[PDB]
Structure 1
Amino acid sequence: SGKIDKILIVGGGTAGWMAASYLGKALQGTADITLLQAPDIPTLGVGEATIPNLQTAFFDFLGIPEDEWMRECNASYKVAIKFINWRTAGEGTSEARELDGGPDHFYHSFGLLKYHEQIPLSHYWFDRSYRGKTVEPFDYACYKEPVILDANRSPRRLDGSKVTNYAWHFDAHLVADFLRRFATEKLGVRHVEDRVEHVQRDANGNIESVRTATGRVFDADLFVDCSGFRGLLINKAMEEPFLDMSDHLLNDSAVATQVPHDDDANGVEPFTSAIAMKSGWTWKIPMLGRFGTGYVYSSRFATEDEAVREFCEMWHLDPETQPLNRIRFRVGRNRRAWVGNCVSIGTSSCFVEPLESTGIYFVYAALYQLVKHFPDKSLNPVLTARFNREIETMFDDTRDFIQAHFYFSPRTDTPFWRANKELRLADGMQEKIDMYRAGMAINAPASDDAQLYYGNFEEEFRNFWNNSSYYCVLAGLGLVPDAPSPRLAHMPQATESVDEVFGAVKDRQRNLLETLPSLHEFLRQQH
């Protein structure tokens, strides 16, 4: 048994061609990579949102500069997720209700909270807010972004210079085809259109070959399952159980479409919107000339017909003739992502609703971990176990985080919102909440330098949902600590000199609002 010579990727979606590119690049010249792709019924481009380390962990690894892949994938910019109507009762409407003398929205941005005297700014904010010396919401106090996104500002100046961390909106299909052109033309990855009919296992349970409907036989040392929800290798052949996590997350379906948009009349929003509905929530993902939107809902509280009506009524579309994608979801993960010589990547591995833009991240996180734990033909079980462990906490921490959005929403107005609250949080989530209520940071980053964070994948992986995110969502929803951090009573000079830090955020808010172009103005100049 020596090094891995041949790899077969089954599936050609976004997960499949990311796997081909990432492995083709990481193993360039030392493995023969073949990807089998069957023709499928095409779907509408309903948009995908990403996170900053898509450029630094994935496209940079491939050697592809941001502007080369954005121009082909007709991409727009994402500075935040804006959460609309999660605290107020009513119908599913794109317009924000009023709450406390302002619109009912909050932002989850990408910046990291600045440390002041070893303590995150979130704790100083809560200190003032608790003692009644401020009523400003958490996000507006601590981040510059909310003010400039309220104004649809660009994250780059017209000279290109970057003023905030950002990620991307795009149609996943265009990226998949950009990558297929890249893997096949630049990395030697070989594309074969064919449909798997039968998987041959040996007496050790490993995959020996796949036989296509053509009668061609593909053998390989390592098999990457990118077949999506079907899991034609990890689940069908290897029989690995799927853990259903509907005791943590009730959402299991979506209806989505794509809406033309006049960017010169209305501008382009530099964020993804997550709009609370009666039985779930709706995404809006701006792109060029159009936006993708989808209603993620719980089949147990809304029939598909009601969801379609709620979804169409909200965008004033025809429930009968609007081209819709109707989807039923597998929510959860495999008991183990990698079994024998079969690695699952993408939705064949795990799926959670895209409330925090993790779909694509789960793909290239797993491949980074796959290469880090790359085997040889002896398939040392410790590599397989280590990988599985990383994939397991990556998903479960996200499941936990996403659940908190529903658990801590104060809404009680529909059976869906009342039911979410009846679920139990996972033990590791409950323990984080206890910490948060006691005034401590949750997974505070070691440094507050965002380049170190978003530029170093292991630093960000080891601390993916950090204190800034927890505050954004938890404080946003209105769950706040029972009392300030007790150290702050012993730090009379820190709590006074901290005002100059909040005032710095305000100076940035005011100055960036006056000098930045709108996102649309910036997009036009690019092209």
Structure 2
Amino acid sequence: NKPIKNIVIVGGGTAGWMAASYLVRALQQQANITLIESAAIPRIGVGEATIPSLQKVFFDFLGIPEREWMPQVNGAFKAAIKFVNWRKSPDPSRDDHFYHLFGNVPNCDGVPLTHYWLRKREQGFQQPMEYACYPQPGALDGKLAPCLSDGTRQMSHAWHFDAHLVADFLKRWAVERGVNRVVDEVVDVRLNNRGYISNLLTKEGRTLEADLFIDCSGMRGLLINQALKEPFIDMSDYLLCDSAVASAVPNDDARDGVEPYTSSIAMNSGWTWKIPMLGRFGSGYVFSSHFTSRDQATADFLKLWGLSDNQPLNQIKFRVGRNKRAWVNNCVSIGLSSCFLEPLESTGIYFIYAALYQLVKHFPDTSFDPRLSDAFNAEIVHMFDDCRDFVQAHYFTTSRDDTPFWLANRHDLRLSDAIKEKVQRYKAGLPLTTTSEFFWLNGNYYCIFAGLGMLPDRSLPLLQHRPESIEKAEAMFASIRREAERLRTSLPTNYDYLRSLRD
């Protein structure tokens, strides 16, 4: 069976160039890659915060270290997501914030630290879960960097970057290693009787042909949805947000610093992201068209940052779900042409590079062994499904009841059987998945659940039997405090740290 030799990618957004660079890297020989991108159809000018796997899976795979791509994409550090007003009905006079931090929680004698903490909360300990279990939340509060000045790593971190530049950086990178860039628009797609893709017909006259097609076309799914007719499984019964109003905002870095984290500020009918980088931050009120008009959400979005009705904006509509199948025949969808959830925990870019890893792990020849396509499709489903559990979990555990949208999340959602079982295990008091990557651990469910004020019914029956164990955990809590303390006096601010990679 002839190998796959000519590859066409449709689209030059983030999904498009990640595919070109990844595929140009994985396919060391017999590979010919063309990416076509309509300059009439712009990129979705967002997608800016990330999870730690980006370096390990994407950039390391390319052979580009953090210090090389960060400066060139206005890169900044994300140590966590800070959740603001998700817990109770909001109150200006109350401090309703929790972090969701990266990195694992230690175990004491085979039981995670979260669980020794809860036994303490049961005796009237007051300190919230994350401040007790992780060394860094206080640092983030003080806007500290995740490294010492000299560059040594002091916490787990992910990144915030400018979406446009990220695309340009990889465009330069890819073209350079022989990727062939075509600026044209695809208008017709031709199938054969069997139902495969023989050719793309472009606006400027070109007929495009290849063994293999990557649909990186955005939510229009030009190849996968339209041409190939593959169903999109709508999932608004699971998660309600379907729209966003976004923009960049000036930051006075020199006086307010630059937060080393993403914020998610709960609103009336959605929530708003804050993604700081040097000079500015990206922000977006992700909302639900069912519960608020787009014009009302604009008003809320401007009201929240004191913007002016003169401020240019990015008005966005999004589809929530996954194609029945990510890869059909000789077409594979990567990015928004495939499955989205909502930006709440940055699972998007992750769906891109994780899919490309799976694509290469399942790479076909021209016979198109459907056993490879099936295996691939199943991994996409599981990755997507897992993520959906976790995002969904931010919503149905809420105590807020002050708006129709918060009522619905609390009440009206369709919940997988898998998220119900996890919730019920947490409610009985059992740790979730711990460790000593295929992903969301006890520590993650715990920050989220504990942050929204749904705690387990009790601490572990087992603990009554292991008093020494309890003591050892006391010591581990004591180290953590020491570490938190050292960091306070040792990290440079995030503003100052970033400022020196070249200003």
TM, length-normalised to structure 2: 0.97
Judge conservation of contact 1:44–1:257 (CA < 8 Å) in 2. Answer: no
Which residue type is aligned with residue 180 of structure 2? Answer: R
What displacement does 1:493 show? 1.2
Which residue type is aligned with residue 111 of structure 2? Answer: I
Whole-angstrom CA distance in 1 between matches of 2:361 and 2:228: 23
Which residue type is aligned with residue 12 of structure 2? Answer: G
Of 408, 421, 429, 1:419 maps to: 408
- Deviation digits for residues 162-188 of structure 1 (CA, Å, limit 9, x no counterpart): 110111111111000000000001x21
Whole-angstrom CA distance in 2 between matches of 1:331 and 1:225: 18
What displacement does 1:43 show? 6.7
Whole-angstrom CA distance in 2 between matches of 1:311 and 1:193: 35
Which residue type is aligned with residue 466 of structure 2? Answer: M
Helix, strand or coil at the partner of 2:70: helix
Judge conservation of contact 1:45–1:258 (CA < 8 Å) in 2. Answer: no
Whole-angstrom CA distance in 2 between matches of 1:366 and 1:88: 37
Matched residue, 1:115? 107
User: How big is the alpha-carbon RMSD for the aligned residues of Structure 1 and Structure 2?
Assistant: 1.3
What displacement does 1:41 show? 5.3
Whole-angstrom CA distance in 1 between matches of 2:387 and 2:32: 34
Judge conservation of contact 1:45–1:292 (CA < 8 Å) in 2. Answer: no
Matched residue, 1:521? 496
Equivalent pairs, count: 501
Matched residue, 2:478? 503
Matched residue, 1:87? 87
Matched residue, 1:457? none
Helix, strand or coil at the partner of 1:470: helix
Matched residue, 1:378? 367
Matches for 1:103-182 after TM superposition, within 5 Å: 103-132=95-124, 134-182=125-173
Which residue type is aligned with residue 106 of structure 1? Answer: F
Unmatched segments (≥5 aa) in structure 2: none
Judge conservation of contact 1:45–1:171 (CA < 8 Å) in 2. Answer: no
What displacement does 1:130 show? 2.0
Matched residue, 1:306? 296
Matched residue, 1:236? 226
Helix, strand or coil at the partner of 1:82: strand
Helix, strand or coil at the partner of 1:57: helix
Judge conservation of contact 1:184–1:190 (CA < 8 Å) in 2. Answer: yes
- Deviation digits for residues 467-522 of structure 1 (CA, Å, limit 9, x no counterpart): 11100101111111111122212222111211000111111111100111110111
Helix, strand or coil at the partner of 1:21: helix
Matches for 1:190-209 after TM superposition, within 5 Å: 190-209=180-199
Whole-angstrom CA distance in 2 between matches of 1:29 and 1:43: 30
Judge conservation of contact 1:198–1:212 (CA < 8 Å) in 2. Answer: yes
Matched residue, 1:64? 64
Of 487, 491, 495, 1:512 maps to: 487
Whole-angstrom CA distance in 1 between matches of 2:47 and 2:283: 7
- Deviation digits for residues 274-325 of structure 1 (CA, Å, limit 9, x no counterpart): 000000000000011000100000000000110000110111112x311011
Matches for 1:311-326 after TM superposition, within 5 Å: 311-318=301-308, 320-326=309-315
Which residue type is aligned with residue 145 of structure 2? Answer: S
What displacement does 1:254 show? 0.3
Whole-angstrom CA distance in 1 between matches of 2:307 and 2:253: 19
Helix, strand or coil at the partner of 2:230: coil
Whole-angstrom CA distance in 2 between matches of 1:97 and 1:373: 52
Whole-angstrom CA distance in 1 between matches of 2:128 and 2:371: 47
Matched residue, 2:53? 53
Helix, strand or coil at the partner of 1:227: coil
Whole-angstrom CA distance in 2 between matches of 1:167 and 1:127: 31
Matches for 1:81-480 after TM superposition, within 5 Å: 81-90=81-90, 97-99=92-94, 103-132=95-124, 134-185=125-176, 187-318=177-308, 320-422=309-411, 423-445=413-435, 447=436, 460-461=437-438, 464-480=439-455
Instruction: Name segments (4+ residues, structure 1) moved above 2 Å.
Output: 40-47, 96-99
Judge conservation of contact 2:211–2:330 (CA < 8 Å) in 1. Answer: yes
Judge conservation of contact 1:241–1:335 (CA < 8 Å) in 2. Answer: yes
What displacement does 1:51 show? 1.2
Report the more deviating stretch, 359-368 or 374-383. Answer: 374-383
Whole-angstrom CA distance in 2 between matches of 1:348 and 1:46: 15
C-alpha spacing 1:275/1:337, structure 2 compared with 1 (3 Å): same
Which residue type is aligned with residue 466 of structure 1? Answer: L
Helix, strand or coil at the partner of 1:347: helix
TM, length-normalised to structure 1: 0.93
What displacement does 1:28 show? 2.2
What displacement does 1:48 show? 0.8
Report the more deviating stretch, 81-90 or 43-52. Answer: 43-52
Helix, strand or coil at the partner of 2:219: helix
- Deviation digits for residues 84-126 of structure 1 (CA, Å, limit 9, x no counterpart): 0001324xxxxx8454xxx210001112010111111111111
Unmatched segments (≥5 aa) in structure 1: 91-95, 448-459
Whole-angstrom CA distance in 1 between matches of 2:171 and 2:184: 16
Helix, strand or coil at the partner of 1:205: coil
Judge conservation of contact 1:255–1:327 (CA < 8 Å) in 2. Answer: yes
C-alpha spacing 1:391/1:444, structure 2 compared with 1 (3 Å): same
What displacement does 1:44 show? 8.6
- Deviation digits for residues 329-355 of structure 1 (CA, Å, limit 9, x no counterpart): 011111111111110000100111111
Whole-angstrom CA distance in 2 between matches of 1:244 and 1:504: 48
Matches for 1:36-51 after TM superposition, within 5 Å: 36-40=36-40, 42=42, 46=46, 48-51=48-51
Whole-angstrom CA distance in 1 between matches of 2:400 and 2:7: 49
Judge conservation of contact 1:47–1:292 (CA < 8 Å) in 2. Answer: no
Whole-angstrom CA distance in 1 between matches of 2:119 and 2:228: 53
